[PDB]
Design an enzyme around this catalytic site. Structure first.
Site, PDB file in Angstrom:
ATOM      1  N   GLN A   1     -21.502  25.852  42.032  1.00  0.00           N
ATOM      2  CA  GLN A   1     -21.464  24.622  42.842  1.00  0.00           C
ATOM      3  C   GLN A   1     -22.333  24.661  44.105  1.00  0.00           C
ATOM      4  O   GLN A   1     -22.837  23.612  44.526  1.00  0.00           O
ATOM      5  CB  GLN A   1     -20.017  24.227  43.184  1.00  0.00           C
ATOM      6  CG  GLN A   1     -19.294  25.108  44.191  1.00  0.00           C
ATOM      7  CD  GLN A   1     -17.816  24.782  44.273  1.00  0.00           C
ATOM      8  OE1 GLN A   1     -17.027  25.233  43.440  1.00  0.00           O
ATOM      9  NE2 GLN A   1     -17.428  23.990  45.282  1.00  0.00           N
TER      10      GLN A   1
ATOM     11  N   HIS B   1      -8.813  23.862  46.174  1.00  0.00           N
ATOM     12  CA  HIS B   1      -9.918  24.272  45.305  1.00  0.00           C
ATOM     13  C   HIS B   1      -9.556  24.078  43.841  1.00  0.00           C
ATOM     14  O   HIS B   1      -8.510  24.548  43.413  1.00  0.00           O
ATOM     15  CB  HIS B   1     -10.254  25.742  45.541  1.00  0.00           C
ATOM     16  CG  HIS B   1     -11.370  26.256  44.687  1.00  0.00           C
ATOM     17  ND1 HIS B   1     -12.474  25.496  44.369  1.00  0.00           N
ATOM     18  CD2 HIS B   1     -11.557  27.456  44.091  1.00  0.00           C
ATOM     19  CE1 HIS B   1     -13.289  26.204  43.607  1.00  0.00           C
ATOM     20  NE2 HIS B   1     -12.761  27.399  43.435  1.00  0.00           N
TER      21      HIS B   1
END
Ligand SMILES: *[C@@H]1CC(=O)N[C@@H](C(C)C)C(=O)N[C@@H](Cc2ccc(O)cc2)C(=O)OC[C@@H]1NC(=O)[C@@H](NC(=O)[C@H](Cc1ccc(O)cc1)NC(=O)C/C=C\CCCCCC)C(C)C
Length: 215
Positions: free
Chosen positions: A19, A162
């Site tokens: 990411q 997360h």
């Protein structure tokens, strides 16, 4: 359910993505879940587009944040998600360029696991495939994981910050675990993966914001 499950061995799971600085964790979690369901249905695996989700899921905050349900709900109403080939990851939030020619998966709907139910998530993973889970990954002990079954008494189940992917479960040295795919690249963890503690009073809130698409 079985004692051992590992959908990486059935070809459901794509490589460990990265990411980067962009907080598009939800998009990587979502794509991971769809990718799994694509292989089950069609026989063919490929990378679906996290950037498609980042740019077009208007109900989420792109790199700022987002939920997986919203990304699944987007793919249903949109009637598609592009491939990584069709729509690649650039690492920023920008304009939607969904092209329905480069379509790769669709989504019939989604389902949610009951809150704080690790047994339900176990039954989900075993039957469906890679399930999207959110967790507390703020701890240093989480950051610098390298081997074993991970646990920390600091790990606040109610601070879910997360999104990752439960691609399986098992046991390792008598410590039951969830096999988890992160999206911080191949050099984090054990080749991108972490084994987080299963049936340990919902360790890091693994079972709290858990869901899968139906394809
Ligand atoms: C993806 C996670 C990520 O990339 N990184 C996380 C790190 C590794 C811990 C991270 O930074 N997560 C949070 C921020 C954070 C850091 C540290 C602590 O202790 C707590 C939070 C983050 O926002 O990262 C983005 C991704 N995460 C999510 O989308 C998750 N959602 C949230 O964390 C949360 C929304 C929420 C969750 C539960 C609730 O009950 C209510 C609300 N986000 C926020 O609170 C931040 C909101 C707005 C930030 C605007 C920033 C503007 C900058 C210009 C999701 C549950 C998967």
């Amino acid at each position: 359910a079985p004692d051992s499950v590992d959908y990486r061995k059935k070809g459901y799971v794509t490589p460990v993505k990265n990411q980067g600085q962009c907080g598009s964790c939800w998009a990587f979690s979502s794509v991971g879940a769809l990718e799994g369901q694509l292989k089950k249905k069609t026989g063919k695996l490929l990378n679906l587009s996290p950037q498609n989700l980042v740019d077009c899921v208007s109900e989420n905050d792109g790199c700022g944040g987002g939920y997986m349900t919203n990304a699944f709900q987007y793919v249903q109403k949109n009637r598609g998600i592009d491939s990584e080939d069709a729509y690649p990851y650039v690492g920023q939030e920008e304009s939607c360029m969904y092209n329905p020619t480069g379509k790769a998966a669709k989504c019939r709907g989604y389902r949610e696991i009951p809150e704080g139910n690790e047994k339900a998530l176990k039954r989900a993973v075993a039957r469906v495939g890679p399930v999207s889970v959110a967790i507390d990954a703020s701890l240093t002990s989480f950051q610098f994981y390298s081997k074993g079954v991970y646990y920390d008494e600091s790990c606040n189940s109610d601070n879910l910050n997360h999104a990752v992917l439960a691609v399986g479960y098992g046991i390792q040295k008598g410590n039951k675990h969830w096999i988890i795919k992160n999206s911080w690249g191949e050099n984090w963890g054990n080749k991108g993966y972490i084994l987080m503690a299963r049936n340990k009073n919902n360790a890091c809130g693994i079972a709290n914001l858990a869901s899968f698409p139906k394809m």
